[PDB]
């Protein structure tokens, strides 16, 4: 995690929600991401942090006491997990659908080729692609 | 990157945009993130991938030929960079403001304590927090 312009100790993707319990069920019970942090009533906010898989890179979800909304869902706004082992991919996506989460048709037919898209409680597109990603070279 | 439910080879945060050139100026020229991939005219889409800082965790921005919009900006939707070295933090945020990007007042006064929020071309809140993040323990 040494960037060109600076040294980053950690990186966090923070998103708002109006249903933090639903979010927890999907991410903790569904994906089985480890809860690496949480806070109750801080400046009117409640939140939880999930490892991705650890603290270096993690997710944070927050809900405001006076009502909060999640980002407006965009079908092209994704969180992609490159899972080269097709058996594990099938297992996780199957568990999520059996828990009640919808598999949707990706906007780009590309992610449809060897990929499965499941919407999280707030419509964020969680993609599981059967590959190793990009080489970057 | 060994998750409980599966082995992830890579992780990608993909977001849509209607101004991919502006996005490139901010991320490549501004943040100086390395371009680890790109594609022209694939299923009507154009896109670019930026390391965070490498391929294991990276960002992808896509624009559709037939017009595309970026996610609806939410003031609580963040990308947080934990930069413990206050001098580097000051340097990067200063470069971005001098390039023309706006520093905004975070929703949560929390990120206001030792943190600087700059909006990217499409309103995503890029936060630079002067800390090491969460321990996770």
Swiss-Prot record, chains A, B:
Pfam short name (any one): YycE-like_C
InterPro entries: Glyas_Bleomycin-R_OHBP_Dase, VOC
All copies of domain VOC, residue ranges: 7-131
Domain of life: Bacteria
Gene3D superfamilies: 2,3-Dihydroxybiphenyl 1,2-Dioxygenase, domain 1
The name this protein goes by in its record: Uncharacterized protein YycE
The encoding gene: yycE
């Amino acid at each position: 995690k040494r960037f060109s312009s600076f040294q980053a100790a950690q990186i966090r993707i923070a998103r708002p929600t109006g249903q933090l319990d639903e979010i927890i069920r999907f991410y903790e019970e569904g994906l089985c991401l480890k809860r690496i942090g949480e806070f109750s009533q801080h400046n009117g906010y409640d939140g939880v942090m999930f490892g991705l898989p650890h603290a270096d890179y993690h997710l944070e979800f927050t809900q405001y006491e006076g009502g909060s909304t999640a980002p407006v869902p965009h079908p092209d706004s994704l969180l992609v997990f490159y899972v080269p082992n097709a058996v594990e991919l099938a297992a996780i996506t199957s568990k999520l659908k059996h828990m009640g989460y919808q598999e949707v048709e990706s906007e780009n037919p590309y992610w449809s080729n060897g990929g499965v898209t499941i919407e999280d409680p707030d419509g964020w597109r969680i993609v599981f692609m059967n590959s190793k990603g990009i080489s970057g070279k």
